[PDB]
Amino acid sequence: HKILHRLLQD
Amino acid sequence: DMPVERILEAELAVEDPVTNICQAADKQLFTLVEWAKRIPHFSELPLDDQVILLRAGWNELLIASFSHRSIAVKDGILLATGLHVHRNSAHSAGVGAIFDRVLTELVSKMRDMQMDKTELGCLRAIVLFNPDSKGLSNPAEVEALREKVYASLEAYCKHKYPEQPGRFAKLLLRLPALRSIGLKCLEHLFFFKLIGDTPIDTFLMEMLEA
Ligand SMILES: CC[C@H](C)C1=C(CCC(C)C)/C(=C/C(C)=C\C=C\C(C)=C\C(=O)O)CCC1
């Protein structure tokens, strides 16, 4: 779930 | 611990018709992450559980948003991209049945009771804090957050609409329809992916992953 992971961490 | 003023602030902070709808869905998935970050205590959950809650509730969360946005129009849905999909356009594209379900079970009922943005945001926060989601590291904490949302929602309803004692229950009883409509829309989207002649963008595609 690359996109969701990246958006939540930022 | 769960004030309705911050939930409303989250709503206001985020401001072939099948192809147009799928493009708007992908656009709003990015916006949905920013919305959830602004819901109190969501960002404090473990990162794996933030992922689980959004992957479990994204379709219901997006449907509630464009349904409430469309109470201003008749026989139509307002997309976040500025486009309008008329009931006749959806019917002529072969998706009239589910379109009519959205208009009848969600949009018209939202318009009939004049559901406001604070109530919409609270209902979306209840959907977001779904303690039944599989894989949650601590389902009890999510259940506690959901309880705080609908405790604050009821207090808001009794205070702003004292003459409508059944309003809090009326809001919650749209959630079974939202759940059923969300499941059907996912069913359609998987069929579109299987056929493969409908453009599906990367974030929408990721939500279709196992
Ligand atoms: C062609 C109808 C078909 C079944 C379909 C639906 C249902 C659209 C409704 C209007 C019937 C979708 C809804 C979701 C799961 C999300 C919608 C997000 C949008 C469109 C948000 C916005 O514009 O704010 C996306 C995938 C395809």
Side-chain angles (χ1 to χ4, degrees), chain B residues 16-29 58-67 69-70 76-83 85 90 93-103 181-182 184-190 192 198 204:
Chain B
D16 198 1
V18 175
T19 293
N20 291 312
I21 290 167
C22 286
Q23 285 174 339
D26 186 79
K27 177 196 206 295
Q28 288 312 98
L29 277 172
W58 70 269
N59 49 311
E60 288 177 41
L61 291 166
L62 294 189
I63 290 163
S65 280
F66 70 70
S67 294
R69 179 193 307 131
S70 303
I77 290 296
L78 291 211
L79 308 182
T81 54
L83 313 176
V85 183
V95 293
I98 189 59
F99 200 88
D100 282 349
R101 285 198 65 187
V102 167
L103 297 180
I181 286 168
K184 185 59 62 173
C185 295
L186 260 187
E187 199 176 323
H188 280 92
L189 189 50
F190 276 114
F192 299 152
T198 286
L204 187 59

Side-chain angles (χ1 to χ4, degrees), chain B residues 15 37 75 90 120 179 188:
Chain B
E15 210 206 18
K37 288 164 168 281
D75 315 322
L120 173 77
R179 168 74 57 89
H188 280 92

Side-chain angles (χ1 to χ4, degrees), chain B residues 52-120:
Chain B
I52 284 170
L53 289 180
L54 277 167
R55 283 182 55 83
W58 70 269
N59 49 311
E60 288 177 41
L61 291 166
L62 294 189
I63 290 163
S65 280
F66 70 70
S67 294
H68 189 267
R69 179 193 307 131
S70 303
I71 68 196
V73 310
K74 169 190 217 253
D75 315 322
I77 290 296
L78 291 211
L79 308 182
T81 54
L83 313 176
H84 171 274
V85 183
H86 196 272
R87 179 177 173 271
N88 295 337
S89 298
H91 177 82
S92 68
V95 293
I98 189 59
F99 200 88
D100 282 349
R101 285 198 65 187
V102 167
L103 297 180
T104 300
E105 291 166 51
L106 296 179
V107 174
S108 67
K109 295 327 253 163
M110 269 156 183
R111 183 172 46 237
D112 281 346
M113 63 195 282
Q114 294 180 75
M115 173 192 294
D116 64 49
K117 288 197 168 106
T118 295
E119 301 171 311
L120 173 77

Side-chain angles (χ1 to χ4, degrees), chain A:
Chain A
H1 312 317
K2 288 167 181 243
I3 302 166
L4 184 57
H5 262 273
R6 293 167 174 170
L7 285 178
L8 287 168
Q9 174 270 330
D10 185 26

